Amino acid sequence: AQYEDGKQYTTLEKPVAGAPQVLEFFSFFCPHCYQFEEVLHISDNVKKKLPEGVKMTKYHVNFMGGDLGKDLTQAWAVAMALGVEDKVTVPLFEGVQKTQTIRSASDIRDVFINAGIKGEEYDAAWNSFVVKSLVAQQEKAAADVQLRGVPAMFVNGKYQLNPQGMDTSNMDVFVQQYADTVKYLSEK
Numbered sequence: 001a002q003y004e005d006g007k008q009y010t011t012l013e014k015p016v017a018g019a020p021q022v023l024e025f026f027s028f029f030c031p032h033c034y035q036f037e038e039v040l041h042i043s044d045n046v047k048k049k050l051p052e053g054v055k056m057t058k059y060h061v062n063f064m065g066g067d068l069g070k071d072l073t074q075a076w077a078v079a080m081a082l083g084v085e086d087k088v089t090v091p092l093f094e095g096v097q098k099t100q101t102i103r104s105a106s107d108i109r110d111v112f113i114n115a116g117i118k119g120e121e122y123d124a125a126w127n128s129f130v131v132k133s134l135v136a137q138q139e140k141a142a143a144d145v146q147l148r149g150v151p152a153m154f155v156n157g158k159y160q161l162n163p164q165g166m167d168t169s170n171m172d173v174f175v176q177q178y179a180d181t182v183k184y185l186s187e188k
């Protein structure tokens, strides 16, 4: 077959019911996640190939980067709560991995301030139970799949993308294979 269980994707032995349609996990400490975001634009290219009926979710993980990694999961909850993901993703990746200027929770906050989020608004969100609930949702979704690595993408709590077998000589072809695989899996 063109798409084969075990090749372009794997099938979870323990399927997760009630899972998001398309669920991505990442860490701002994760080098391939940096590539997925600013080099490949995986999420946008996946979105462009799905109908308006399939929704996309993207969650941060705790298991990379120690204390700061956990701070970044809470900051990502702030980004989701305020709807400013598109404003802070590139600066957070650059701050962690390129300039290495993000070393503390205050340095994370600075990225939001520079992106135009008011300080009192960031602080209110950071300390809010709405954000605490989003942190809990991110942790529970990762735990449901016993997640041990990023980047990772899951379709309908049933299928996990397997990019390792794909040709990476051309980046545009790789991204297209990835998105077409997500589309195929979403249609199963």
Ligand SMILES: Cn1nccc1CN
Binding pocket: 106, 109, 119, 123
């Ligand atoms: C710098 N910082 N971090 C959290 C709260 C404050 C002061 N507004």
